[model samples]
Target: GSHMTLRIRTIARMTGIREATLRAWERRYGFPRPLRSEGNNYRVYSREEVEAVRRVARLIQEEGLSVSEAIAQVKTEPPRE
Candidate 1:
């Protein structure tokens, strides 16, 4: 479906983030607030959330920012198109 939510594994694959990293970020930053899948009690992220994580990863990997810095940058900047 066009509107399918992504599982943690798929998000990790697409965003190049480990599942543990995602969990850690959620714990510390309170960002990427994924919804819980009642069927399996798993985390599920929307496409926009996935894209946001991609941007944050880019800021860290390509721009040489720390996780906190990247998160702050994302918070202030408009979302990428």
Candidate 2:
């Protein structure tokens, strides 16, 4: 029920990921489920999903994790900090 939708560029900006990478993750990891915008024919993400993606990305960047390991840890364990 959102009036505005965040597209691939917006998500990339928020998550610090390239759009291509996001698409690859969508096809491969299955962590995010971006909504499709009919008007623009682009992928859009919800605010919470965007936040989660950013948090996971931060963990990978700062914690030096391989993508798979970081995702697994994030999904299974609560971050200490």
Residue 81's C-alpha lDDT in candidate 1?
57
Find the 10 residues in a row with the least total lDDT in model 1: 57-66
Worst 10 residues of 2 by lDDT: 62-71
Residue 57 miss distance in model 2 (angstroms) = 1.3
Cα lDDT tens digits, model 2, 1-81, are 554657767877754554555676777686556665454567666666666666666665665453566567657864442
Shift of residue 29 alpha carbon in model 1, Å: 0.9
Best by TM-score: 1
Q: Cα deviation in Å at residue 44, candidate 2?
A: 1.4
Candidate 1 overall Cα lDDT vs. reference?
0.70
| Candidate 1 lDDT, 1-81, residue by residue in tens | 467887767877855554656777878887677686653656777887777777666666665445677667668974765
